[PDB]
């Protein structure tokens, strides 16, 4: 199983745990959790080993504990290099090891940046290869977490909806792109199209016409 | 001390594909290495592994049959080959070794292995396999005409990736290249914005050069209002 929080949160400076569930074979088996770091595109970092060891070179700030079926990695003293992911891992009857789901930990050293959004309609070019697709732009914004919804007439549309994972950009916002994919006739069907993008509730709204 | 892991490898579905993992710095036989795989945006998943020096392994029942770890210590290299490859066998495939020996000479030089050690400590670069159905294509690039902004749209291409320069690398200021996605047809499409002043659109011409190494494909595109 290993069944982990799906995010945790903090702010610099304040503990921070993780939870890691396990049966009675899985953790409280054997003493072989460990807890692995990783940050986006790089291979998983080993934090703590059998429980609580914490190998050389990791931040005294790390530290693992274990309480029956659940252990507990704990970071004091936040930092921003301690934005990534962590795994829970655990040796298990039948010589097999299993992993966690991970815990995506973001700390909020930044002031929330509303979204940039920007519409465009299909191209001409591209009508003409019988396919008309809507792109919509989001950038400059923070924390990394938006939520897209496509409007044709005020109307919800969810058919054809594909809307890229924010990433990190060079001032370390977040940059995400959602593409509507209509047929030539529908995105002549209806007067307008409306890309409606919300971060932290505020929510920005950038529509097109066939025009 | 390093665990040299192969370049990037595609293949199609059903097809095979053997992944090497060479190690240097310490003595390659008695370490165990195992493999653990991770999905694109999900969490890290076990494989298997081997002791070299004996060839003995530990496969997951998730994927007995197919799996097949081996390791030639003549080249101090470990192979995990996985048959019958699926789109969802689509991840990224690393190779770890343990802190400690997993096979120990005892006194006696007789040998003897080591306790369920902790077996993930030095990890390899990993290596992308994509496994897709779509072959190679080239992008179409579609002009996204336009304080201005204005961009070229790469769609319908396959694999990764494609680089995009405005104005053969002269425009470098204000340009976003988003991350491509990948639609339900297994083709990738990314899109390229720039931000330009209003009074430039009908002074300045912007072209967006868009290159795919995997097609052998040079695209120049210009974009006006």
């Known amino acids: 199983a290993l069944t982990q929080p799906r995010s945790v949160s903090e702010s610099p400076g304040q503990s921070v745990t993780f939870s890691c569930t396990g049966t009675?074979?899985?953790?409280?088996?054997?003493?072989?959790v460990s807890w692995f770091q990783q940050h986006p595109e790089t291979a998983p970092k080993l934090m703590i080993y059998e429980v609580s060891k914490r190998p050389s070179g990791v931040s005294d700030r790390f530290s693992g504990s274990k309480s029956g079926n659940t252990a507990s990695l704990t970071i004091s003293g936040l930092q921003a290099e301690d934005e990534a992911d962590y795994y829970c891992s655990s040796y298990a009857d039948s010589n097999t090891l299993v992993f966690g789901g991970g815990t995506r930990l973001t700390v909020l050293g930044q002031p929330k940046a509303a979204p940039s959004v920007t519409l465009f309609p299909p191209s001409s070019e591209e009508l003409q290869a019988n396919k008309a697709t809507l792109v919509c732009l989001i950038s400059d914004f923070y924390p990394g977490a938006v939520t897209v919804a496509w409007k044709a007439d005020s109307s919800p549309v969810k058919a054809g909806v594909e809307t890229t994972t924010p990433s990190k950009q060079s001032n370390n916002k977040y940059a995400a792109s959602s593409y509507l994919s209509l047929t030539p006739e529908q995105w002549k069907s209806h007067r307008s199209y409306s890309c409606q993008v919300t971060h932290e509730g505020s929510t920005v709204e950038k529509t097109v016409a066939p025009t | 001390v390093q665990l040299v892991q192969s370049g990037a490898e595609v293949k199609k579905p059903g097809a095979s594909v053997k992944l090497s993992c060479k190690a240097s710095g310490y003595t390659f036989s008695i370490y165990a290495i195992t493999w653990v795989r991770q999905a694109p945006g999900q969490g890290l998943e076990w494989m298997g592994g081997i002791i070299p020096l004996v060839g003995i392994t530990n496969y997951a029942q998730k994927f007995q049959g197919r799996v097949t770890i081996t390791a030639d210590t003549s080249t101090t290299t470990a192979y995990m080959e996985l048959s019958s490859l699926r789109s969802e066998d689509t991840a990224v495939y690393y190779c770890s070794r343990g802190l400690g020996p997993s096979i120990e000479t005892e006194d006696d030089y007789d040998y003897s292995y080591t306790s369920e050690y902790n077996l993930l400590h030095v990890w390899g670069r990993g290596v992308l396999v994509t496994v897709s159905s779509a072959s190679t294509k080239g992008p179409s690039v579609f002009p996204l005409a336009p304080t201005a902004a204005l961009g070229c749209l790469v769609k319908d291409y396959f694999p990764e990736p494609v680089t995009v320069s405005w104005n053969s690398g002269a425009l470098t200021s204000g340009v976003h290249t988003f991350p491509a996605v990948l639609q339900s047809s297994g083709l990738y499409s990314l899109s390229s914005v720039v931000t330009v002043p209003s009074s430039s659109l009908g002074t300045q011409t912007y072209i967006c050069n868009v290159n795919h190494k995997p097609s052998n494909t040079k695209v120049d595109k210009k974009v006006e209002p």
């Open positions: 009675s074979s899985d953790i409280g088996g054997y003493n072989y």
